[PDB]
Structure 1
């Protein structure tokens, strides 16, 4: 819902939970991996079938910054039973590695096959305000810092030029004989990201990371929205 930012702010929250961020992003027409928040093993299985296999499970705790490190993430679950295994394994994993940690729930989300990992950012600058960022995403975002910036709202020129300027742009036009990815989808995502910035003053920072680009369309795998 568009008002999710409001509810978060009134609850003294400085950020949105992954599933909330994804709902909010989706309501602006940016494609996202279908996600649900399970609060029981049974709800998990149900949501797993409602989403379709294979699926991914993530713990939702405030005291767990790096989930993978505590074994709070299970990837590529293909069967109901495999899902139940993972559901319990994550819970017990978190309790052992971080007992104090409170549990909010388990996130079930569609599995995203491999592809060009991109990042789409949104930052509020004191001078220029809503600003959009683009570049190679994934885990190695900060390593190359191969990025571009544009002040919102973005024209088609702005979005198109900020894509061609990054060095990694070569990946998007077919590299190693690879099939070129959907650039128009990316442009649309960038323009819409800009709109989110302009219309939502309470957003300080936003991270669409990773954003998998395929030959046809794109998908936001993970999102992070920092409020102010």
Structure 2
């Protein structure tokens, strides 16, 4: 029934999942995510913001699509300013879209950023990619690949493959992170690719790693 999300999307001609639907999906596979709900108004949002815990951040959720992001809403009375401002911000900057709502997102503590990817190679089919976030993939292209399904051995070794690995084993002002949780996530990522033929690619970016556990902060799922 998690697949309902992929079916409803395919039904509505969409070739990707909205930010919140994407997280719900990977969460159903046991990959930890930052907790969220999608605002259907300010009233729903503030209570939703009241519902999941503070502080809370707001974004934009529309199949269409810039200045659509806020930060640190501390108070349920205070929340009201930022939503209007976004819907106030969007129209002046950009005119048209079906707005499913505004995302009410849980705050994520700072940590070591990671990248977990899923692509489909013509030869080998679903392949999982790993690398550390920031400049280490965007700039240096320091990534590793394993063809799914992933064994625990595959997961462990592809993590140690990357040249930025030492950023996981503790360094200046940063304690070592939970490698087991990363291995777990990499294997479940591969599982998502093997099982769902209708997923063309998946980007877990950024993923934050803590001394215990990890959190997917943003998830991107393209369809086909």
**Shorter-normalised TM range:** over 0.9
For residue 37 of structure 1, give the secondary structure of its aligned residue in structure 2: strand
Which segments of 5 or more consecutive residues in structure 1 lack a partner in the other structure?
A: 66-70
C-alpha contact 2:136 2:164 (8 A) present in aligned 1: no
* C-alpha distance in structure 2 between counterparts of 1:95 and 1:138, whole Å: 31
Q: CA RMSD in A?
A: 1.4
Q: Which moved more, 1:115-124 or 1:74-83?
A: 74-83
1:10 Cα deviation from its structure 2 partner: 2.1
Distance 1:165 1:224, change over 3 A: same
Distance 1:188 1:120, change over 3 A: same
Distance 1:94 1:118, change over 3 A: same
C-alpha contact 1:172 1:180 (8 A) present in aligned 2: yes
1:84 Cα deviation from its structure 2 partner: 1.1
Q: Which moved more, 1:134-143 or 1:27-36?
A: 134-143
With structure 2 as the length reference, what TM-score do the two structures score? 0.95
1:204 Cα deviation from its structure 2 partner: 0.5
Could you give the per-residue CA deviations for residues 177-217 of structure 1, whole angstroms, max 9, x where no partner exists?
A: 52100000000000000000000001001000000000110
1:90 Cα deviation from its structure 2 partner: 0.6
Distance 1:63 1:7, change over 3 A: closer
Hey, what does 1:175 align to over in structure 2?
Answer: 171
Distance 1:36 1:102, change over 3 A: same
Number of positions where the alignment pairs a residue of Structure 1 with one of Structure 2: 223
With structure 1 as the length reference, what TM-score do the two structures score? 0.93
Identify which of 123, 127, 132 aligns with 2:123: 127
1:138 Cα deviation from its structure 2 partner: 4.1
1:104 Cα deviation from its structure 2 partner: 2.5
1:139 Cα deviation from its structure 2 partner: 6.9
Could you give the per-residue CA deviations for residues 62-108 of structure 1, whole angstroms, max 9, x where no partner exists?
A: 4437xxxxx21001211113321111111100010012344221000
C-alpha contact 1:138 1:209 (8 A) present in aligned 2: no
1:12 Cα deviation from its structure 2 partner: 1.5
Distance 1:103 1:139, change over 3 A: farther
Which segments of 5 or more consecutive residues in structure 2 lack a partner in the other structure?
A: none
For residue 178 of structure 1, give the secondary structure of its aligned residue in structure 2: coil
* C-alpha distance in structure 2 between counterparts of 1:53 and 1:2, whole Å: 30
